[PDB]
Design an enzyme around this catalytic site. Structure first.
Site, PDB file in Angstrom:
ATOM      1  N   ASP A  70       0.824  -1.198   0.000  1.00 18.92           N
ATOM      2  CA  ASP A  70       0.000   0.000   0.000  1.00 18.92           C
ATOM      3  C   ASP A  70       0.864   1.257   0.000  1.00 18.92           C
ATOM      4  O   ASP A  70       0.429   2.345   0.370  1.00 18.92           O
ATOM      5  CB  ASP A  70      -1.072  -0.033   1.124  1.00 18.92           C
ATOM      6  CG  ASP A  70      -0.597   0.552   2.458  1.00 18.92           C
ATOM      7  OD1 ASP A  70       0.608   0.440   2.835  1.00 18.92           O
ATOM      8  OD2 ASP A  70      -1.469   1.072   3.198  1.00 18.92           O
ATOM      9  N   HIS A  83      -1.706   2.989  11.044  1.00 20.32           N
ATOM     10  CA  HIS A  83      -2.089   4.132  10.216  1.00 20.32           C
ATOM     11  C   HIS A  83      -3.403   3.847   9.511  1.00 20.32           C
ATOM     12  O   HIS A  83      -3.686   2.706   9.162  1.00 20.32           O
ATOM     13  CB  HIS A  83      -0.982   4.550   9.226  1.00 20.32           C
ATOM     14  CG  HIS A  83      -0.584   3.496   8.235  1.00 20.32           C
ATOM     15  ND1 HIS A  83       0.715   3.256   7.860  1.00 20.32           N
ATOM     16  CD2 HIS A  83      -1.338   2.643   7.497  1.00 20.32           C
ATOM     17  CE1 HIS A  83       0.702   2.293   6.935  1.00 20.32           C
ATOM     18  NE2 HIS A  83      -0.527   1.888   6.679  1.00 20.32           N
ATOM     19  N   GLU A 101       4.478  -5.065  16.479  1.00 16.22           N
ATOM     20  CA  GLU A 101       4.310  -4.500  17.816  1.00 16.22           C
ATOM     21  C   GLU A 101       3.574  -5.558  18.609  1.00 16.22           C
ATOM     22  O   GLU A 101       3.005  -6.445  18.012  1.00 16.22           O
ATOM     23  CB  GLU A 101       3.455  -3.239  17.731  1.00 16.22           C
ATOM     24  CG  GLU A 101       3.689  -2.407  16.470  1.00 16.22           C
ATOM     25  CD  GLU A 101       5.051  -1.753  16.424  1.00 16.22           C
ATOM     26  OE1 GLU A 101       5.733  -1.795  17.455  1.00 16.22           O
ATOM     27  OE2 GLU A 101       5.443  -1.157  15.373  1.00 16.22           O
ATOM     28  N   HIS A 118      -7.830   5.838  18.158  1.00 18.81           N
ATOM     29  CA  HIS A 118      -7.117   6.937  17.517  1.00 18.81           C
ATOM     30  C   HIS A 118      -7.229   6.811  15.998  1.00 18.81           C
ATOM     31  O   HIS A 118      -7.716   7.727  15.329  1.00 18.81           O
ATOM     32  CB  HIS A 118      -5.647   6.915  17.906  1.00 18.81           C
ATOM     33  CG  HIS A 118      -4.854   8.024  17.299  1.00 18.81           C
ATOM     34  ND1 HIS A 118      -4.625   9.229  17.913  1.00 18.81           N
ATOM     35  CD2 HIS A 118      -4.255   8.115  16.086  1.00 18.81           C
ATOM     36  CE1 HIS A 118      -3.918  10.001  17.080  1.00 18.81           C
ATOM     37  NE2 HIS A 118      -3.665   9.374  15.950  1.00 18.81           N
ATOM     38  N   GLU A 119      -6.769   5.676  15.470  1.00 16.33           N
ATOM     39  CA  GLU A 119      -6.793   5.404  14.036  1.00 16.33           C
ATOM     40  C   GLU A 119      -8.153   5.539  13.396  1.00 16.33           C
ATOM     41  O   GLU A 119      -8.287   6.138  12.326  1.00 16.33           O
ATOM     42  CB  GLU A 119      -6.250   4.014  13.721  1.00 16.33           C
ATOM     43  CG  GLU A 119      -4.787   3.817  13.990  1.00 16.33           C
ATOM     44  CD  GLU A 119      -3.935   4.903  13.418  1.00 16.33           C
ATOM     45  OE1 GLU A 119      -4.376   5.632  12.530  1.00 16.33           O
ATOM     46  OE2 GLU A 119      -2.796   5.056  13.870  1.00 16.33           O
ATOM     47  N   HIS A 122      -9.255   8.751  12.344  1.00 16.86           N
ATOM     48  CA  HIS A 122      -8.681   9.167  11.076  1.00 16.86           C
ATOM     49  C   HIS A 122      -9.552   8.681   9.952  1.00 16.86           C
ATOM     50  O   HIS A 122      -9.787   9.400   8.985  1.00 16.86           O
ATOM     51  CB  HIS A 122      -7.307   8.564  10.905  1.00 16.86           C
ATOM     52  CG  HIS A 122      -6.233   9.324  11.606  1.00 16.86           C
ATOM     53  ND1 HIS A 122      -6.135  10.693  11.591  1.00 16.86           N
ATOM     54  CD2 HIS A 122      -5.179   8.890  12.338  1.00 16.86           C
ATOM     55  CE1 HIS A 122      -5.062  11.037  12.286  1.00 16.86           C
ATOM     56  NE2 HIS A 122      -4.442   9.980  12.766  1.00 16.86           N
ATOM     57  N   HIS A 128      -5.114  15.600  13.519  1.00 20.09           N
ATOM     58  CA  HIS A 128      -4.527  15.438  14.857  1.00 20.09           C
ATOM     59  C   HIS A 128      -4.859  16.637  15.731  1.00 20.09           C
ATOM     60  O   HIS A 128      -5.332  17.662  15.265  1.00 20.09           O
ATOM     61  CB  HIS A 128      -3.001  15.294  14.811  1.00 20.09           C
ATOM     62  CG  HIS A 128      -2.527  13.965  14.321  1.00 20.09           C
ATOM     63  ND1 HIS A 128      -1.383  13.791  13.576  1.00 20.09           N
ATOM     64  CD2 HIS A 128      -3.070  12.726  14.455  1.00 20.09           C
ATOM     65  CE1 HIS A 128      -1.275  12.490  13.279  1.00 20.09           C
ATOM     66  NE2 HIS A 128      -2.277  11.802  13.793  1.00 20.09           N
TER      67      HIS A 128
END
Ligand SMILES: CC(C)C[C@H](N[C@H](CCNC(=O)OCc1ccccc1)C(=O)O)C(=O)N[C@@H](Cc1ccccc1)C(=O)NCCN1CCOCC1
Ligand SMILES: [Ca+2]
Ligand SMILES: [Zn+2]
Ligand SMILES: [Zn+2]
Length: 168
Positions: A70, A83, A101, A118-119, A122, A128
Protein backbone atom coordinates in the site's frame (compact mmCIF):
# COMPACT_ATOMS: atom_id res chain seq x y z
CA UNK A 1 -6.32 22.31 19.22
CA UNK A 2 -7.25 20.15 16.19
CA UNK A 3 -6.66 20.87 12.44
CA UNK A 4 -9.29 19.05 10.25
CA UNK A 5 -8.70 18.50 6.47
CA UNK A 6 -11.64 17.61 4.12
CA UNK A 7 -13.11 14.15 3.15
CA UNK A 8 -16.00 12.81 5.25
CA UNK A 9 -18.38 9.82 4.85
CA UNK A 10 -21.60 11.08 3.34
CA UNK A 11 -23.48 8.28 5.16
CA UNK A 12 -24.07 7.89 8.91
CA UNK A 13 -24.28 4.12 8.96
CA UNK A 14 -20.94 2.58 8.06
CA UNK A 15 -19.95 -1.11 8.06
CA UNK A 16 -16.59 -2.62 8.95
CA UNK A 17 -14.78 -5.89 8.72
CA UNK A 18 -11.79 -7.16 10.65
CA UNK A 19 -9.86 -9.14 8.01
CA UNK A 20 -7.44 -10.89 10.41
CA UNK A 21 -6.36 -11.08 14.06
CA UNK A 22 -3.20 -10.66 16.10
CA UNK A 23 -2.01 -13.91 17.63
CA UNK A 24 -1.06 -11.74 20.62
CA UNK A 25 -4.46 -11.60 22.21
CA UNK A 26 -7.62 -13.75 22.02
CA UNK A 27 -10.03 -13.13 19.15
CA UNK A 28 -12.70 -11.91 21.54
CA UNK A 29 -10.36 -9.32 22.99
CA UNK A 30 -9.51 -8.02 19.52
CA UNK A 31 -13.17 -7.86 18.47
CA UNK A 32 -14.12 -6.02 21.63
CA UNK A 33 -11.30 -3.42 21.54
CA UNK A 34 -12.23 -2.57 17.98
CA UNK A 35 -15.90 -2.48 18.89
CA UNK A 36 -15.27 -0.28 21.88
CA UNK A 37 -13.15 2.14 19.83
CA UNK A 38 -16.03 2.59 17.37
CA UNK A 39 -18.43 2.97 20.32
CA UNK A 40 -16.50 6.13 21.38
CA UNK A 41 -17.19 8.09 18.21
CA UNK A 42 -20.73 6.78 18.07
CA UNK A 43 -21.37 8.19 21.55
CA UNK A 44 -21.04 11.79 20.38
CA UNK A 45 -22.31 11.83 16.81
CA UNK A 46 -25.17 10.43 14.73
CA UNK A 47 -22.91 7.69 13.32
CA UNK A 48 -23.52 3.96 13.52
CA UNK A 49 -21.18 1.08 12.70
CA UNK A 50 -21.97 -2.58 11.97
CA UNK A 51 -19.54 -5.51 12.14
CA UNK A 52 -19.63 -7.60 8.96
CA UNK A 53 -18.12 -11.06 8.44
CA UNK A 54 -18.05 -10.60 4.71
CA UNK A 55 -19.45 -8.52 1.88
CA UNK A 56 -18.62 -4.89 1.20
CA UNK A 57 -17.61 -3.02 4.34
CA UNK A 58 -16.59 0.61 4.55
CA UNK A 59 -13.78 0.20 7.10
CA UNK A 60 -11.42 -2.73 6.74
CA UNK A 61 -9.08 -3.40 9.64
CA UNK A 62 -6.03 -5.67 9.39
CA UNK A 63 -2.77 -6.42 11.17
CA UNK A 64 0.18 -6.24 8.79
CA UNK A 65 3.99 -6.00 9.02
CA UNK A 66 6.57 -4.21 6.85
CA UNK A 67 5.69 -3.89 3.16
CA UNK A 68 2.03 -4.77 2.91
CA UNK A 69 1.32 -3.50 -0.59
CA UNK A 70 0.00 0.00 0.00
CA UNK A 71 3.11 2.12 -0.61
CA UNK A 72 3.63 2.88 3.06
CA UNK A 73 5.46 -0.10 4.72
CA UNK A 74 5.75 -0.68 8.46
CA UNK A 75 9.03 -0.32 10.32
CA UNK A 76 9.08 -3.35 12.59
CA UNK A 77 8.81 -3.20 16.40
CA UNK A 78 8.50 0.35 17.74
CA UNK A 79 8.08 3.62 15.89
CA UNK A 80 5.08 3.59 13.53
CA UNK A 81 2.41 1.42 15.15
CA UNK A 82 -0.44 1.79 12.72
CA UNK A 83 -2.09 4.13 10.22
CA UNK A 84 -5.49 4.68 8.67
CA UNK A 85 -6.75 6.33 5.48
CA UNK A 86 -9.28 9.19 5.43
CA UNK A 87 -12.88 8.68 4.17
CA UNK A 88 -13.11 7.33 0.62
CA UNK A 89 -13.63 4.15 -1.52
CA UNK A 90 -11.08 1.35 -1.68
CA UNK A 91 -8.50 1.82 1.05
CA UNK A 92 -10.42 4.90 2.09
CA UNK A 93 -11.31 4.42 5.76
CA UNK A 94 -9.12 1.31 6.23
CA UNK A 95 -6.80 0.78 9.19
CA UNK A 96 -3.62 -1.31 9.35
CA UNK A 97 -1.87 -2.28 12.58
CA UNK A 98 1.83 -3.01 12.68
CA UNK A 99 2.00 -6.70 13.62
CA UNK A 100 5.60 -6.29 14.71
CA UNK A 101 4.31 -4.50 17.82
CA UNK A 102 2.90 -6.51 20.74
CA UNK A 103 -0.80 -5.73 21.00
CA UNK A 104 -2.13 -5.76 24.58
CA UNK A 105 -5.33 -4.90 26.39
CA UNK A 106 -3.91 -3.38 29.56
CA UNK A 107 -1.18 -0.93 30.64
CA UNK A 108 1.50 -3.08 28.97
CA UNK A 109 2.93 -1.29 25.98
CA UNK A 110 0.54 -0.98 23.03
CA UNK A 111 -3.02 -1.33 24.20
CA UNK A 112 -4.94 -2.22 21.01
CA UNK A 113 -8.06 -0.31 22.06
CA UNK A 114 -6.17 2.95 22.64
CA UNK A 115 -4.48 2.87 19.22
CA UNK A 116 -7.60 1.61 17.38
CA UNK A 117 -9.72 4.46 18.75
CA UNK A 118 -7.12 6.94 17.52
CA UNK A 119 -6.79 5.40 14.04
CA UNK A 120 -10.52 5.01 13.51
CA UNK A 121 -10.86 8.72 14.17
CA UNK A 122 -8.68 9.17 11.08
CA UNK A 123 -10.91 6.82 9.09
CA UNK A 124 -13.78 9.17 9.94
CA UNK A 125 -11.91 12.29 8.86
CA UNK A 126 -10.20 13.50 12.01
CA UNK A 127 -6.92 15.35 11.86
CA UNK A 128 -4.53 15.44 14.86
CA UNK A 129 -4.81 17.55 17.97
CA UNK A 130 -2.11 19.69 19.65
CA UNK A 131 -3.74 19.01 23.02
CA UNK A 132 -1.53 16.48 24.80
CA UNK A 133 -4.61 15.06 26.51
CA UNK A 134 -6.90 14.51 23.52
CA UNK A 135 -7.22 11.15 21.82
CA UNK A 136 -6.13 12.48 18.45
CA UNK A 137 -2.75 13.71 19.70
CA UNK A 138 0.06 12.52 17.40
CA UNK A 139 1.81 10.06 19.81
CA UNK A 140 0.66 7.17 22.00
CA UNK A 141 -0.34 7.88 25.59
CA UNK A 142 -2.27 5.71 28.05
CA UNK A 143 -3.76 7.31 31.16
CA UNK A 144 -5.21 3.93 31.92
CA UNK A 145 -8.46 5.19 30.43
CA UNK A 146 -9.53 6.01 26.85
CA UNK A 147 -12.27 8.63 26.57
CA UNK A 148 -12.54 11.45 24.03
CA UNK A 149 -11.11 14.76 25.13
CA UNK A 150 -12.96 17.99 24.31
CA UNK A 151 -10.74 18.35 21.24
CA UNK A 152 -11.96 15.00 19.93
CA UNK A 153 -15.62 15.68 20.71
CA UNK A 154 -15.32 19.03 18.96
CA UNK A 155 -13.44 17.85 15.91
CA UNK A 156 -15.68 14.89 15.14
CA UNK A 157 -18.96 16.71 15.86
CA UNK A 158 -17.97 19.53 13.52
CA UNK A 159 -18.01 16.98 10.73
CA UNK A 160 -20.92 14.75 11.57
CA UNK A 161 -23.08 16.55 14.02
CA UNK A 162 -23.79 15.82 17.66
CA UNK A 163 -25.73 12.96 19.19
CA UNK A 164 -29.27 13.41 20.55
CA UNK A 165 -29.11 10.64 23.11
CA UNK A 166 -27.21 10.83 26.39
CA UNK A 167 -24.35 8.40 27.12
CA UNK A 168 -24.86 5.48 29.46
C1 LIG B 1 -0.84 8.18 17.93
C2 LIG B 1 -0.61 6.68 17.73
C3 LIG B 1 -1.57 5.83 18.59
C4 LIG B 1 -0.63 6.29 16.26
C5 LIG B 1 0.47 6.80 15.28
N1 LIG B 1 0.13 6.26 13.89
C6 LIG B 1 0.10 7.13 12.70
C7 LIG B 1 1.57 7.48 12.51
C8 LIG B 1 1.89 7.80 11.10
N2 LIG B 1 2.05 6.55 10.39
C9 LIG B 1 2.08 6.55 9.09
O1 LIG B 1 2.22 5.47 8.50
O2 LIG B 1 1.94 7.81 8.50
C10 LIG B 1 1.83 8.01 7.09
C11 LIG B 1 0.55 7.37 6.60
C12 LIG B 1 -0.68 7.82 7.07
C13 LIG B 1 -1.83 7.18 6.68
C14 LIG B 1 -1.72 6.10 5.80
C15 LIG B 1 -0.49 5.68 5.29
C16 LIG B 1 0.63 6.31 5.71
C17 LIG B 1 -0.87 8.34 12.92
O3 LIG B 1 -1.70 8.22 14.00
O4 LIG B 1 -0.91 9.39 12.30
C18 LIG B 1 1.86 6.26 15.55
O5 LIG B 1 2.21 5.17 15.05
N3 LIG B 1 2.65 7.04 16.32
C19 LIG B 1 3.99 6.61 16.80
C20 LIG B 1 5.06 7.73 16.55
C21 LIG B 1 5.42 7.99 15.08
C22 LIG B 1 4.71 8.96 14.37
C23 LIG B 1 4.75 8.96 12.99
C24 LIG B 1 5.52 8.05 12.32
C25 LIG B 1 6.30 7.15 13.04
C26 LIG B 1 6.26 7.13 14.42
C27 LIG B 1 3.91 6.30 18.31
O6 LIG B 1 3.22 6.94 19.06
N4 LIG B 1 4.66 5.37 18.77
C28 LIG B 1 5.00 5.21 20.17
C29 LIG B 1 6.52 5.35 20.33
N5 LIG B 1 7.15 6.69 20.18
C30 LIG B 1 8.06 6.94 19.06
C31 LIG B 1 8.87 8.25 19.32
O7 LIG B 1 8.11 9.35 19.81
C32 LIG B 1 7.49 9.00 21.01
C33 LIG B 1 6.43 7.90 20.65
CA1 LIG C 1 6.24 -0.46 13.90
ZN1 LIG D 1 -0.90 0.28 5.21
ZN1 LIG E 1 -2.79 9.90 14.04
Amino acid sequence: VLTEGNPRWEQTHLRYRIENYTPDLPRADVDHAIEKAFQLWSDVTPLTFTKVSEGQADIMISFVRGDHRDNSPFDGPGGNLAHAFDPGPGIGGDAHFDEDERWTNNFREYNLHRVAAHELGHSLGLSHSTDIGALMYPSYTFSGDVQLAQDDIDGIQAIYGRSQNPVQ
